[PDB]
Short mmCIF file of C-alpha atoms and ligand atoms in Angstrom, two decimals:
data_model
loop_
_atom_site.label_atom_id
_atom_site.label_comp_id
_atom_site.label_asym_id
_atom_site.label_seq_id
_atom_site.Cartn_x
_atom_site.Cartn_y
_atom_site.Cartn_z
CA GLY F 1 -2.55 -3.13 17.97
CA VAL F 2 -4.28 0.05 16.74
CA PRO F 3 -5.87 -0.79 13.27
CA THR F 4 -4.37 0.83 10.13
CA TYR F 5 -6.20 1.97 7.05
CA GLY F 6 -5.01 3.09 3.69
CA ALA F 7 -5.22 2.35 -0.04
CA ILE F 8 -3.99 0.32 -2.94
CA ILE F 9 -4.11 2.75 -5.76
CA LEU F 10 -3.87 1.35 -9.25
CA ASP F 11 -3.59 3.06 -12.60
CA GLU F 12 -5.87 2.79 -15.57
CA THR F 13 -4.22 -0.28 -16.99
CA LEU F 14 -4.48 -2.17 -13.69
CA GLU F 15 -0.75 -3.09 -14.19
CA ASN F 16 0.73 -0.63 -11.67
CA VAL F 17 0.31 0.16 -8.00
CA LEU F 18 1.37 3.26 -6.07
CA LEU F 19 3.82 2.69 -3.24
CA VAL F 20 5.44 5.16 -0.85
CA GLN F 21 8.84 5.06 0.76
CA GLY F 22 9.32 6.26 4.27
CA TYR F 23 12.24 7.02 6.56
CA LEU F 24 14.04 5.32 9.46
CA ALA F 25 12.13 2.15 10.47
CA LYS F 26 9.70 2.86 7.60
CA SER F 27 12.53 3.00 4.99
CA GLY F 28 11.02 0.32 2.71
CA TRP F 29 8.29 0.70 0.10
CA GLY F 30 4.75 0.10 1.26
CA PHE F 31 1.13 1.05 0.55
CA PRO F 32 0.08 4.37 2.02
CA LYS F 33 -1.63 3.78 5.35
CA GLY F 34 -1.64 4.77 8.96
CA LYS F 35 -3.22 4.42 12.36
CA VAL F 36 -6.88 5.16 13.04
CA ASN F 37 -7.65 8.14 15.40
CA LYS F 38 -10.21 7.81 18.27
CA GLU F 39 -13.83 7.76 16.95
CA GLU F 40 -12.59 7.94 13.25
CA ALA F 41 -14.44 5.85 10.65
CA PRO F 42 -12.26 3.41 8.59
CA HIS F 43 -12.99 5.20 5.28
CA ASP F 44 -12.05 8.55 6.80
CA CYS F 45 -8.76 7.27 8.24
CA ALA F 46 -7.85 5.69 4.82
CA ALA F 47 -8.51 8.95 3.03
CA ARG F 48 -6.64 11.04 5.59
CA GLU F 49 -3.55 8.85 5.64
CA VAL F 50 -3.47 8.58 1.87
CA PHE F 51 -3.89 12.32 1.43
CA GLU F 52 -1.11 12.97 4.08
CA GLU F 53 1.26 10.57 2.40
CA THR F 54 0.52 11.21 -1.32
CA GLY F 55 -1.43 14.44 -1.67
CA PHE F 56 -4.16 12.54 -3.52
CA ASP F 57 -7.69 12.52 -2.18
CA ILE F 58 -9.47 9.17 -2.49
CA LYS F 59 -12.63 10.11 -0.72
CA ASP F 60 -14.84 10.32 -3.88
CA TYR F 61 -13.40 6.93 -5.11
CA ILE F 62 -13.56 4.65 -2.13
CA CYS F 63 -15.90 1.71 -2.44
CA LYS F 64 -16.96 0.30 0.90
CA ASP F 65 -16.70 -3.36 0.06
CA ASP F 66 -13.55 -3.19 -2.04
CA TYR F 67 -10.56 -3.68 0.24
CA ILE F 68 -7.97 -6.21 1.37
CA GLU F 69 -7.57 -6.70 5.05
CA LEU F 70 -4.77 -8.59 6.80
CA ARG F 71 -3.99 -9.23 10.40
CA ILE F 72 -0.30 -9.28 10.95
CA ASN F 73 0.98 -9.91 14.49
CA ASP F 74 -2.33 -9.10 15.91
CA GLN F 75 -2.71 -5.72 14.12
CA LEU F 76 -5.35 -5.29 11.49
CA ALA F 77 -4.45 -3.46 8.22
CA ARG F 78 -7.14 -2.63 5.74
CA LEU F 79 -6.37 -1.14 2.29
CA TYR F 80 -9.13 0.06 0.09
CA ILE F 81 -8.69 -0.76 -3.55
CA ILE F 82 -8.75 2.36 -5.78
CA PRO F 83 -8.33 1.53 -9.53
CA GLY F 84 -8.12 3.76 -12.47
CA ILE F 85 -6.01 6.62 -11.15
CA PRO F 86 -4.02 8.14 -14.10
CA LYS F 87 -0.33 7.49 -14.08
CA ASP F 88 0.30 11.20 -14.70
CA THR F 89 -1.29 12.23 -11.38
CA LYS F 90 0.97 14.58 -9.38
CA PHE F 91 1.46 13.07 -5.99
CA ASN F 92 3.18 15.08 -3.26
CA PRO F 93 3.25 14.23 0.47
CA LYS F 94 1.96 16.67 3.08
CA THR F 95 4.21 14.90 5.60
CA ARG F 96 7.49 15.44 3.62
CA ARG F 97 9.27 14.80 6.94
CA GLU F 98 7.95 11.14 6.80
CA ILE F 99 7.82 10.32 3.00
CA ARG F 100 10.98 10.04 0.89
CA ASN F 101 9.47 9.19 -2.44
CA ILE F 102 6.29 7.98 -4.12
CA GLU F 103 6.39 5.72 -7.20
CA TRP F 104 4.40 3.45 -9.41
CA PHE F 105 5.45 -0.22 -9.46
CA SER F 106 4.55 -2.96 -11.87
CA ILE F 107 2.38 -5.42 -10.02
CA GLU F 108 3.66 -8.37 -11.93
CA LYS F 109 7.32 -7.49 -11.03
CA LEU F 110 6.70 -7.05 -7.28
CA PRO F 111 7.55 -9.95 -5.08
CA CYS F 112 4.81 -11.80 -3.24
CA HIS F 113 7.28 -13.40 -0.71
CA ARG F 114 10.86 -12.68 0.43
CA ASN F 115 13.62 -15.16 -0.60
CA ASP F 116 15.06 -17.52 1.94
CA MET F 117 18.88 -18.02 2.39
CA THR F 118 19.06 -21.77 1.49
CA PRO F 119 22.18 -21.15 -0.66
CA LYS F 120 23.92 -20.06 2.62
CA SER F 121 22.29 -22.89 4.82
CA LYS F 122 21.10 -20.10 7.05
CA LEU F 123 17.55 -19.67 8.51
CA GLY F 124 15.35 -16.72 7.86
CA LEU F 125 14.67 -14.33 4.98
CA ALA F 126 16.87 -11.97 2.97
CA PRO F 127 16.05 -8.26 3.31
CA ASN F 128 13.66 -6.90 0.68
CA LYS F 129 12.74 -3.33 0.23
CA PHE F 130 9.11 -4.27 -0.47
CA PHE F 131 8.73 -6.18 2.87
CA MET F 132 5.61 -4.25 3.94
CA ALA F 133 3.90 -4.41 0.58
CA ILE F 134 4.59 -8.10 0.11
CA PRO F 135 1.77 -9.61 2.26
CA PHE F 136 -0.82 -7.76 0.12
CA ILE F 137 0.47 -8.79 -3.30
CA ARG F 138 -1.00 -12.23 -3.74
CA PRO F 139 -4.33 -11.30 -2.18
CA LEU F 140 -4.38 -8.28 -4.57
CA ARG F 141 -3.63 -10.35 -7.67
CA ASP F 142 -6.41 -12.75 -6.57
CA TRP F 143 -8.83 -9.91 -5.92
CA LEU F 144 -8.12 -8.34 -9.35
CA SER F 145 -8.69 -11.73 -11.09
CA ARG F 146 -12.07 -12.18 -9.41
CA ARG F 147 -13.26 -8.54 -9.91
CA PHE F 148 -11.94 -7.91 -13.45
CA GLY F 149 -10.44 -11.09 -15.00
C1 LH7 B 201 5.84 -0.12 8.98
C2 LH7 B 201 6.75 0.07 7.82
C3 LH7 B 201 6.51 0.71 6.60
C4 LH7 B 201 5.30 1.34 6.10
O1 LH7 B 201 4.45 1.84 6.85
N1 LH7 B 201 5.22 1.37 4.76
C5 LH7 B 201 5.47 2.58 3.98
C6 LH7 B 201 5.08 3.86 4.69
C7 LH7 B 201 6.01 4.84 4.96
C8 LH7 B 201 5.66 6.01 5.61
C9 LH7 B 201 4.35 6.18 5.96
F1 LH7 B 201 3.99 7.33 6.60
C10 LH7 B 201 3.39 5.24 5.71
C11 LH7 B 201 3.76 4.08 5.05
C12 LH7 B 201 7.71 0.59 5.89
N2 LH7 B 201 8.64 -0.05 6.57
N3 LH7 B 201 8.07 -0.39 7.77
C13 LH7 B 201 8.90 -1.12 8.75
C14 LH7 B 201 8.24 -2.20 9.62
C15 LH7 B 201 9.36 -2.80 10.42
S1 LH7 B 201 10.67 -2.99 9.27
O2 LH7 B 201 10.71 -4.34 8.79
O3 LH7 B 201 11.89 -2.44 9.79
C16 LH7 B 201 10.00 -1.92 8.03
#
């Protein structure tokens, strides 16, 4: 899979994270990210995708060792952690044909797993609009505990 890069943007209180909502297959909420171009450095891809999806430029804020990286179905996704962005920042996508909306979410209210369907004795997981964000939530909470406490 082609690797993806993007960001976890947090506000000044460290309570809230910025998610984006796409269209079609990408209808759920997720962290801003996208696929790396040929010869593009990870930091440059993260900044480009985030600026395309949110209109906010992270380039001056990225720290090289501060990221969460997950390999899901043999595709690597790396999100740089960007704290301290004011909640009153005006975010606006460049790609308004791919982004429906952009919102802050309380980290403590976000799920870190989807719910099963054990009440219905049925296998699998119930739909959840945060499906794509979910795998990052526990690692993020653990990362914020180690870094800040
Ligand atoms: C890959 C994905 C996203 C996602 O990328 N996050 C938000 C986002 C939206 C636009 C954008 F330009 C960049 C990020 C969201 N949903 N999905 C689908 C995977 C298969 S599914 O389970 O049907 C849901």
